[PDB]
Design a binder for this molecule. Structure first.
Ligand code: HEM
Ligand code: HEM
Lengths: 713, 713
């Protein structure tokens, strides 16, 4: 707050809300990580007594703590909801969210309206975390706790991979929406059965995982509700069959909590008093825990056996007629008509209750597509147990990346369809000699070296580190849909692919156990051509393998196509986001620092990596040679810039004295001479003494981008 | 801006404005720095062609650019205003501000209402910056140019020291106030002829260096304005003699710029259009530069020779009688009654104007203290030239720290009185053998380990890294005023002092050439005792020297006294700042990271380093022994915390099951269990396996704080 000390007062984001900020390129630095400079989590997790941990977790399941009693004497439901919220913030649009980094323990996820009582679920795990030390991460423990919960209650899981490391601060790269009040949704829509949800959002309300459990805007309309679910689960990469299996297999266990009115519930953890030690939502109704618990405000128990696996959910949903009703907190729900109390009380073994359900649940039976799927699962209970295991596995591992980052003994042998699988290498990798020889032979194809660089950059810059999907490995720029991407210049892309293919056959044809993939050739062309342009030895690591179309879902990769790509002078801004805002977002996705971003733009520009051959930002008289001309000419004090039109995207550089026309540029260029912090970076590379340095930084930054997905390393 | 991209949307700061933030402990990381990791500026500066640069700067002075013409054909006035705004934000209260880091390039300083047209000033210097590369920093260059401007106009400077490294981010640890409107000041007063300026501000308006030029809230009352100057210059470390020499010697050159109404002037750099390339304040009046310039809106020119040194300012101020008038922009100014046009026009050699002055200037002749000093400078033109040179030198180097950090060939050999000088070592330093022997001798004294540690921490803990003042070197804890600071526990401090004094004397007797200081002894007392209580070897670097009271201005050191010190469980919050906010601010001043802050408190607490002997946060059964007990007991889920009163500062830890009383604490303790990001740090050290790790981190963090001022190294 604006209090008179270090940390306080009005900030820059206060005076200039529209201004571009580079904070997301400065996150997750070592300084804020307490671990030892050489800590390797993968190695520490492998040394873990994994079955020891699982037993410990199984034990915790029936270990009721008086401070947060276990419902039914078993914490599984709570732990299943914990892990499904950790994982469920994921959106396929930008790949952000999910449980890959355990962000549920930080703001704002820790204090979301959907995350009530999940604070207590995490505190229940501290003793076990304390024991395993740094060999298990909160990121992995949160999810494995949900697996163990399912296995403890008789459900057979599909697998589990660990390796997720821990983070130390809140991640500022995610846009969760623009609304300023919790549960607000006014801005992401643009109401009834026909409103459109704003990209990249995958949730209908701020502070919610997917949908309103009472119904859209609190209206219990289950068909209108089913339409929200399809959309939100679609943006989280789940189809109809997987959505039904998740909700049913999930609400197959536990209960909701809404024992009394919600005014009785206090501050969220980030606003809660310091003596509460990180727990929020202090409840003044009754005991405030156990049976008097208040989480969502809904009082629903779905099955006759909440702590045991079975078909109660789909069975009860299809056997009773349901009528709307209200909860002890005023929330919209449903209850069964003409039915005796068959559901157990969480605290009283002598009581049983009437079946209840949620609007979102009823929606699964009322939507014609969901109905059909639900009846198929009733008709074959085994297909259901299998679909849910599979969808649960997908839920917890969809933001984990290539199987090469998957660790542990429960890792599945079976390749999954959503995996983006690349076949391991099974031949002799090429050596320093084939490499030198291959460079030569590529360049000698007569393919314009600007094409070789453009395509290698197009192949790599496709990675996004949030998700860990994309990149040069697999060479899917050759497959759909990346080959018709406009940003990828498909006519060129093909000329380059034809050339690399021919080179590929002559090598693999020379017999021997040595082979080269196309993914490695595409990078190698950039490498050859870059070396030609700088005179510097450009590093190169072989080992990529080619990928097939079957493991390349066209729909999946539809989300990876940029709207605007500044590294390539493509696209323009929107009414809500400026061109330069899209570039900073893309740099974040490629894990680039601010200086790395700066080097790459100057280099790619003098090297002609513009998607359509425009001359925007080619501030060089020698296109094709890697010099520091871009920077020297941008900061050149005798050039002036006027906008070239009204849109404000292309500009003209002209001589102050003379007024002669010199150059053309976009916003992705001028921001580097306009933004004070970026300009300081450009000044380093534009100094009389900075070219040698710049060239080194660019080849480092280039090689970095070329290996962004090489987890197999 | 809440744009639907990475970097956009509602933030944690929006949802929780009161929430403590750890950003200031994550600043200025290597990731944001472009320079190669080996880079050493001090070495690069020493290799500068220092004289070639001064020559160049001298040529630049008369090198009028058409894009921003020189007044009188000499950019010196502008360059002097530039360097006096770079250095003039300094303040002694917290030591923040000043020109030590070149923060004037970054927001908000680059866009302050007082720094109009300095964006153009710095742009004039880019060619020269481009020439000399990384061997000169903007931080040094900005201030050197101010010195070359004076020399070029016939004034003799006292010296110049370089060594200021550049920065790359805006600094977020400075509280410029809480007003949300530029030039506003409703918040820092808390109306009247005499009001109190709030600590630690040293400016009467937001966006201003010191005072309003038209007068308080724009009223032209010079006496009332003199009270503002005395206060603001007091908070910037200047006395009445130095204040008069600075304003007079400064407004002895150049002019102001207020040619037309200010509604003609456009946005500041941070809000200016992209094609402006970092320059703001586009002026639509006339040519918008040169004679049509509009900077502050005041049209004043002080001396008949604005590009030449002499006594015109003091002379004209004392020769004519003044009447208030208005500027072409409506600003309140003064003009001479009964005079001819004697001062020249900046563009017209055939025009001359009447004597003019500012309210703040006139204030120097109206306040009875300033009048007396004004008169003595008129009486002695030599003492004036010398005072000005010395105040200028003080202005540009007041935040640079010990002479050990000063570099270059124009460094003065004369020791200044505001320096905090420490004599260099002129004897043989103690060797590994005298350290082992003294360690044993000091603990043999029988002084309690908790006192040896507490005093070594009290000595070292006094450093602030903004200013580079404080710390163990010099052993000024012995001197005034630290010797009677309540947080230092003066009774205990004296005891420890006596004991150390005795050890020092026996060592200094015979053993000949080899001596030891009391500063090395105070620090060593801690090391010995820390080793005893840890079983680890605690590093130690000797070479500290003692300092005398003649070089320990008691008014300077009064500002280093903390209001609250969480490391020693001292003090409490105000109505505007919470206890835990004061601790994060103090950690910033000691340059500590978040994990270093966490380690230090757990360690200092089990070692009993509380100022009054309280048991606040001593969460160990074995006090005086270094363990991770602190974090174990803090994060224990079977303990709960009630506030101990209606105040919210002290708390009681009790058992949940038996309600038995366990601990006592303050807000400096509980925040590590409440704040999500700090709690993650504590969890590392509370792990079954984290005690040896912790202990190591604490001895590293301890030795770090012990050498914070050792620039001599
Ligand atoms: C339409 C989508 C979904 C919505 C809107 C939703 C909403 C809710 C709500 C409001 C509760 C009650 C919260 C409380 O008061 O404790 C609940 C319970 C629960 N949900 Fe969901 N849910 C959905 C789908 C799922 C899925 C896919 C899973 C897992 C795959 C899941 C797992 C659980 C569990 C385990 C509980 C019980 C937690 C406990 O016993 O404390 N839900 N759900
Ligand atoms: C009472 C304190 C002071 C105030 C309020 C003040 C304010 C101002 C203002 C408003 C201007 C005209 C700005 C413009 O339109 O260009 C100015 C000019 C100037 N001031 Fe100060 N000033 C103060 C003291 C000083 C000091 C201590 C120095 C240096 C030691 C200094 C150096 C200058 C210079 C060099 C100029 C002329 C800049 C140019 O020619 O562009 N001033 N001052």
């Amino acid at each position: 707050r604006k209090s008179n000390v270090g940390g306080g007062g009005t900030r820059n984001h206060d005076w200039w809300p529209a201004q571009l900020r580079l904070n997301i390129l400065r996150q997750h630095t070592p300084v804020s990580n307490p671990l030892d400079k050489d800590f390797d989590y993968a190695a520490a997790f492998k040394s873990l007594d994994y079955e020891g941990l699982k037993k410990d977790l199984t034990k915790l399941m029936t270990d009721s703590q008086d401070w947060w009693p276990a419902d039914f004497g078993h914490y599984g439901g709570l732990f299943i909801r914990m892990a499904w919220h950790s994982a469920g913030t994921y959106r396929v649009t930008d790949g952000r969210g999910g449980g890959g980094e355990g962000q549920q323990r930080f703001a704002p996820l820790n204090s979301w309206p959907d995350n009530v009582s999940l604070d207590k679920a995490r505190r229940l795990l501290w003793p076990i975390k304390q024991k395993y030390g740094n060999k298990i991460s909160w990121s992995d423990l949160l999810l494995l706790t949900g697996n163990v919960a399912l296995e403890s209650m008789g459900f057979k899981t599909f697998g589990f991979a660990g390796g997720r490391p821990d983070t130390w601060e809140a991640d500022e790269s995610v846009y969760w929406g623009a609304e300023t009040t919790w549960l607000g949704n006014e801005d992401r829509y643009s109401d009834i059965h026909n409103r459109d949800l704003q990209s990249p959002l995958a949730s209908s309300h701020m502070g919610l995982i997917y949908v309103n459990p009472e119904g859209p805007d609190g209206i219990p309309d289950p068909v209108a509700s089913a339409k929200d679910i399809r959309v939100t689960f679609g943006r989280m990469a789940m189809n109809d069959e997987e959505t039904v299996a998740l909700i049913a297999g999930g609400h197959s266990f536990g209960k909701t909590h809404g024992a009394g009115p919600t005014h009785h519930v206090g501050k969220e953890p980030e606003a809660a008093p310091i003596e509460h030690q990180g727990l929020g939502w202090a409840n003044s109704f009754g005991q405030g825990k156990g049976p008097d618990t208040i989480t969502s405000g809904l009082e629903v128990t779905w099955t006759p056996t909440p702590t045991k696996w079975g078909m109660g959910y789909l069975e009860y949903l299809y056997k009773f007629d349901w009528e709307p009703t209200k909860s002890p907190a005023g929330a919209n729900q449903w209850v069964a008509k003409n039915a005796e109390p068959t559901i157990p009380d969480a605290y009283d073994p002598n009581k049983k209750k009437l079946p209840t359900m949620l609007t979102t649940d009823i929606a699964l039976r009322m939507d014609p597509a969901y109905d059909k799927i639900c009846r198929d699962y009733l008709a074959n209970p085994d297909k259901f147990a299998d679909a849910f295991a599979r969808a649960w596995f997908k839920l917890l591992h969809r933001d984990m990346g290539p199987r090469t980052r998957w660790i542990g003994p429960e890792v599945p042998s079976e390749i999954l369809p959503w995996e983006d699988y690349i076949p391991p290498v099974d031949y002799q990798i090429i050596d320093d000699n084939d490499i030198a020889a291959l460079k030569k032979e590529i360049l000698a194809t007569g393919v314009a070296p600007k094409k070789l660089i453009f395509v290698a950059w197009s192949s790599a810059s496709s990675f996004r580190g949030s998700d860990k999907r994309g990149g040069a490995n697999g060479a899917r720029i050759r497959l759909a849909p990346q080959n018709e991407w406009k940003v990828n210049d498909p006519s060129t892309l093909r000329e380059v692919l034809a050339a690399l293919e021919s080179v590929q056959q002559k090598f693999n044809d020379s017999s021997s156990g040595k082979k080269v993939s196309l993914a490695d050739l595409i990078v190698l062309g950039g490498v050859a051509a870059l070396e030609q342009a700088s005179g510097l030895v450009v590093p190169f690591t072989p080992g990529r393998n080619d990928a097939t179309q079957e493991h390349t879902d066209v729909h999946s990769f539809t989300h990876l196509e940029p709207h605007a790509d500044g590294f390539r002078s493509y696209g323009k801004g929107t009414k809500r986001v400026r061109t330069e805002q899209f570039l900073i977002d893309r740099a974040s996705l490629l894990t680039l620092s601010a200086p790395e971003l700066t080097a790459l733009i100057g280099g790619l520009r003098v090297l002609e990596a513009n998607y359509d051959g425009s001359s925007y930002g080619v501030l060089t008289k020698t296109p094709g040679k890697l010099t520091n001309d871009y920077f020297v000419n941008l900061l050149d004090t005798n050039t002036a810039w006027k906008a070239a039109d009204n849109e404000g995207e292309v500009f003209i550089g002209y001589d102050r004295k003379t007024h002669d026309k010199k150059w053309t540029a976009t916003r992705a260029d001028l921001i580097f001479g306009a933004h004070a912090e970026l300009r300081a970076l450009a000044e380093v590379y534009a100094a009389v003494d900075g070219e040698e340095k710049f060239k080194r930084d660019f080849v480092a930054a280039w090689h970095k981008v070329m290996n962004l997905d090489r987890f197999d390393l």
